[PDB]
Amino acid sequence: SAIENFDAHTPMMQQYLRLKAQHPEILLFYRMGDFYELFYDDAKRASQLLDISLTKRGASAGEPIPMAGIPYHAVENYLAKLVNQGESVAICEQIGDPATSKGPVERKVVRIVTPGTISDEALLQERQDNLLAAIWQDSKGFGYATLDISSGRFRLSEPADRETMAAELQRTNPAELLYAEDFAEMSLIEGRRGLRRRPLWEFEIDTARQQLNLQFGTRDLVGFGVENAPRGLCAAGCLLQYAKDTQRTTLPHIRSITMEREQDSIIMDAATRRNLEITQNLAGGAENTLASVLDCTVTPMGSRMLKRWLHMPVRDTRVLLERQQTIGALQDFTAGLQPVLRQVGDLERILARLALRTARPRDLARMRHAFQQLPELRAQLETVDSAPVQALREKMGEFAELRDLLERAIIDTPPVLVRDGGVIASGYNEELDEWRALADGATDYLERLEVRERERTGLDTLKVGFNAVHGYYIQISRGQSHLAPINYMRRQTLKNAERYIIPELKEYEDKVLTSKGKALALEKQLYEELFDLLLPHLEALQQSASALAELDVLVNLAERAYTLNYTCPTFIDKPGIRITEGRHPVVEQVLNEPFIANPLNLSPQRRMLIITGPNMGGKSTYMRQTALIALMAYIGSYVPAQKVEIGPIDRIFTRVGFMVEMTETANILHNATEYSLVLMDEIGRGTSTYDGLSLAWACAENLANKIKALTLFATHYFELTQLPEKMEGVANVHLDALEHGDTIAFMHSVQDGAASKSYGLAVAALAGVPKEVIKRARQKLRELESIS
Amino acid sequence: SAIENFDAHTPMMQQYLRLKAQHPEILLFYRMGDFYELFYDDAKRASQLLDISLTKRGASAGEPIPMAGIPYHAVENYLAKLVNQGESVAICEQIGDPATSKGPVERKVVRIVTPGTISDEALLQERQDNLLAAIWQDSKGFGYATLDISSGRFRLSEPADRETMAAELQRTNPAELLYAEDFAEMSLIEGRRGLRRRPLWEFEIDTARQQLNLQFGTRDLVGFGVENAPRGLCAAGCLLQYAKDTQRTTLPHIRSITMEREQDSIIMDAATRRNLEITQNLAGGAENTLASVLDCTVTPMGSRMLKRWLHMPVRDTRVLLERQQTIGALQDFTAGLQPVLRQVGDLERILARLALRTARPRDLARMRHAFQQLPELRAQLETVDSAPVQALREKMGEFAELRDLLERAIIDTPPVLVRDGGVIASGYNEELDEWRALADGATDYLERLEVRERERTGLDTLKVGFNAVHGYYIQISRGQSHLAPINYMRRQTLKNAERYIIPELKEYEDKVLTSKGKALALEKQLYEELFDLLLPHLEALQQSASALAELDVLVNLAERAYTLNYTCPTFIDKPGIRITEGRHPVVEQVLNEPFIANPLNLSPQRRMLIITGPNMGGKSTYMRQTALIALMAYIGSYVPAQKVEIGPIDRIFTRVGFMVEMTETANILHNATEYSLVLMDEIGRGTSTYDGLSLAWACAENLANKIKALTLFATHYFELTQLPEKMEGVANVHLDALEHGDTIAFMHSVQDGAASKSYGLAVAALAGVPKEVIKRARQKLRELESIS
DNA sequence: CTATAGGGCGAATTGGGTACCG
DNA sequence: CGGTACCCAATTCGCCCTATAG
Ligand SMILES: Nc1ncnc2c1ncn2[C@@H]1O[C@H](COP(=O)(O)OP(=O)(O)OP(=O)(O)O)[C@@H](O)[C@H]1O
């Protein structure tokens, strides 16, 4: 029974209706007492997801008001439930003091919790980076921006066309994606989690030019080389405004912008990245991954940087030569380095929470702790003789004065909430300890009087205690509550007792609660000053974290290299991969049986290898080993081979395993070049066998006559093995399974040629078919090959 | 630690050591209170599997004794755990009262719980038959015996050689298998669950001749035509003795022996069975099965008989013509038949438990209930005019006197255990009701006194109750346990009260528990008499169950026929299958879009059909449709086609898919004849395309030149399409997927010829490869078919 | 005696109670 | 003033646990 004109509503709902009207397409948490109350349609959705009982707010006005509510202290739990569902939610809070506000207390939206801007640790998987991005389409191309709000890392790109958008979208995997109403290609956008449609006026170039310059404080974006790419800047502006709108505050940690160049990275198509199983397998699990066997790192920061480095393999040689020399020098001390680096903690996400002024003292404990670990690191690092190691040593800095300030201004092990205090250490603010002296004077007076009044009145059941609602009392049991002096003022009546107050206790109760509130407000006001003291050096702290986890990677890649006997690979100028004693990493790390290793050669000349041989012969594992070495070479780490020599590579194509097969193949033969490594796993195997033949036969010839890429074709066809006689670049290689007696063995060893008579003609003799039938095959096997 | 000679042990362990010595190769459950205590090596194995804590019993003997124990009431749970692992276990009990043995109470093995003889319903999957078998090898041949202890159905066979042993072993799937120490072929035996080695003297012919005759009560086994097959009889004898030994009692339900003739059944090889997904899919589940679609049977017995019928398709025409006419006549009344037949219950397993004297009253409820449903069945069946229906009506019988006895001697809804009584109804034994009168006098006296003593003492918290260990008490709360009269004798010191006894209550508690034990022992003694009353007619009851579930099948098939439009198929004398509007049963029951139906013809002449065409085009499902029709023709049911004409069939060979492929192919081409239906599916799958070609090409030619069987070859190879020009009997059939514009359709329609241009050359244009690459395929697709 | 197995001893807690509140 | 935020308290349920005598 609801009429809802502006006037008809009560002053509290009039205030909410305007606040909800600002953000009407998203849910709101509205502070009231100790509960965030939801109303009408919002109360309905909340009841479905949060599974909280849908109730109705009392209709004093007249109109029905569907209502739901959740406790303020447990908000984060429900926020997590909503964030998994990709539900955007606004948080609004009482800004003014309700006593001084005659009308409804001044409420304002404090933050907008979106899947992109979740900076709260509870909502962030520790070894996964959370990202926020928007996307724009012009007739020529697309403007894709990204911001790691949890780090301040801000990126941008102008990818050429639709297929590269998908590669970028999977590689980023943005838990939240903003876009514009005019976006034409709606296949790519639909199905993405936390999908947001936006107004067109937000993607204006002029607004972006000014906004980006204002946030950085630099007059020209020329300082970061982004000026010459306006399409991407537009998305940045909306993202920066969206981030600003969602956090309602300045973002000074976001101090820079960078252009992710296609030229400066290996372009892996989305599909190739599903087959490599870099961090996530085909099944969607985190088992049998390159990451798991390459990852034994101490800090989550280090794992993320590793996962980023894997997704973004770098192409410049200088950066690789710098890293290898460092890892080689660290190898000896790894034993002493790994333990100290573990107590560093999540500095990157800590600094960002500090930047947003939303860091909590348990984070400040990890910060001072990391500050304590730095000097011993500097000591162990000083003895090391290599140029980048001393550079990394300088970059961590000292921050010793800040550590002293923290040790002076925080206790050793702090609580999670500032609301109850006991955070700041004793001797920093003499006034703090003056107010805490009255708090510690609670212990003695209460018991001292509890014995004093017990001695005076002569009542042995006399107990002094504190009730949150009734303040400080004296509890005389019902058996003695008639011998209580006239002085003892009745305060509360109980089941088995009676509670009394005197002006002396009331005077103590007044001074203690006031001194408490004085102590706590001072603690909060100083807790703000801690941010004010440390904010100046935030740029240097952000440089410190950018080196610490940049060291964690270099120490693990040394521990793994020493443990798995990996060797550093030299970079050469010509595209071409030469491997000696090659061992696939993931298999040789989950197999009781030893991995028989195999050398591989790829060159301007050894570009194409046809792989044949029996099923269950691991025809597949031989190729995955090359691609993963080629990837590891360009992350700058060592390789599980005696020696690897790598040539520069622009793109890695792969289709492990019809409609889906031709799409990714068509994609490769249009976008592959001379610097491309292609890895066909099965090809021309759709049906018929005279149809798939006319597909793959041509596919390889085009991959080795024009694209001139490198390929490790795995083909069941025995007719694609005549390519070397017809085409230059191709070379047959075969994985042979041996047969002694009635047992087949899996050698997974790689050699030259392939076998006309198959192990099948011999397998036919094992559990033998009638002798005429096996003879009849021999007659036909001879006939097929001979006529050809 | 001490000497372990016979004397050194304590009297209890001396008794156990001799008992264990009788059965030392199997575990024992030794009755020692609820916990059947297990010792030494047994305690070790128990701790590993039952996951019960391995402890050590005190060394009274002087040597440390390891020990485990499990409660008697929860034995069945641990028995199930052991049965799944195939672990045989003996159950021993204190049979003689403590007086029978001066030392430890007489203890005898009551039963040997083996995976074969599990008659307990809890250990039997309701819709799966449990079996028990032995196998001994002789120079002449193998003797394979089987006993369905849960039914009394006892079979025997003398299979020729090894390959048929495996087919029989899988078809039976004996949860347990017994064999002889001299057994040569140990590949077949190893890997089977609950594997048992036995002494040689058990497989003597003379002992078997006498033992089988003694059990049947027939002077000559000539009464069942088994005399002329001694090898099989030997295994029977051991099995009969093993069954006898395992149950320690007579087996009068096992009243007959039968020789399973290869001639009188369709011989399905083990492998074929796993592919047609008859009861169990490739994945091992019970979903998407012929069973799942053909099984809405109203009693599990009916599903088992269906599954048996499926697993043993019958060959004699008379039995089929009998069944079809019956199902056709039943079709009209199916609506009225299905509900009444549901209340029948598991009569077959019930009668066997009754026979073993191990039936439980919950089973007797289903028996009397089925007896009540018979007259209304006889009424509905009387109006039906067909010869076998009236014959089936006679076979169920009346058993009206037994129903009257059961209605007089069992209550409506009985409990599971006889241990607590309340089973037998009131008016049968006047002495029972005399003892039950004291039991029903428990309700009034307890509450009458509870108020009487409450009125006398003046204590309002006075409660009269019964604790199993402390007997009958009076509970006075701790607040009033000091006002309790001196008469009230303290019994139990409760945590919040005190429990008292007086001689009046004790006198009542004595007379009630004695009268209980008198009532209960009488209930058990009469519960024996129930078996003694029904045992004479057990042969007729076993004939009744053999018709009831044999009716459930004939009504379920009629229902599923009316619903899915199944039509009766005529039998012809020449082997050959003609199908019109053929509809595969499972897919048209799990597929949203319409299953398109398709006709098929198989004859002395149309014996071979090569199936080609696109992948995801049902190259495979159309062949599975024919085999399942051919099977369902020889179970005697209707078929999901307008009309089916079937010719007699001896064997259904089916390979659906290297080492494993050639074994079952070899097996077919040795054991296939003129009456064989073969379904090579994806054959010639040699990983080398050239290799597999030489294999299947010859396989088909041999299947159509000498074996002269019927085949539905599903082949990806497009070279096997030239057979009709080379070989008579072969005929190409193709399932075409259409391509109009940029959409591919799944017609699932069967026509003549094959598609030379494949959907792939068109699919290449969709999500198009470079125009040169698609052109290059055309060039090659033309080249491959033209050269041929 | 030496084991388990029903009995002893807490122990969390959830559906009401109880004001209450701008 | 119509729910609503805060407040229990006597349990049913979970976890020990401690007996003595053929
Ligand atoms: N170097 C090696 N040494 C020992 N075992 C190996 C080696 N490489 C692989 N294997 C094992 O042998 C198995 C071969 O089976 P797999 O299915 O991978 O064969 P495949 O020929 O790659 O199959 P497909 O032809 O379907 O791609 C692997 O799964 C792995 O367990």
Ligand SMILES: Nc1ncnc2c1ncn2[C@@H]1O[C@H](COP(=O)(O)OP(=O)(O)OP(=O)(O)O)[C@@H](O)[C@H]1O
């Ligand atoms: N009669 C039908 N009409 C329409 N769709 C069908 C029909 N039968 C099956 N389908 C659907 O089309 C799919 C075709 O795949 P299916 O596995 O049957 O192909 P197949 O050629 O038998 O495969 P394979 O050659 O690998 O054995 C089925 O999975 C099902 O979803």
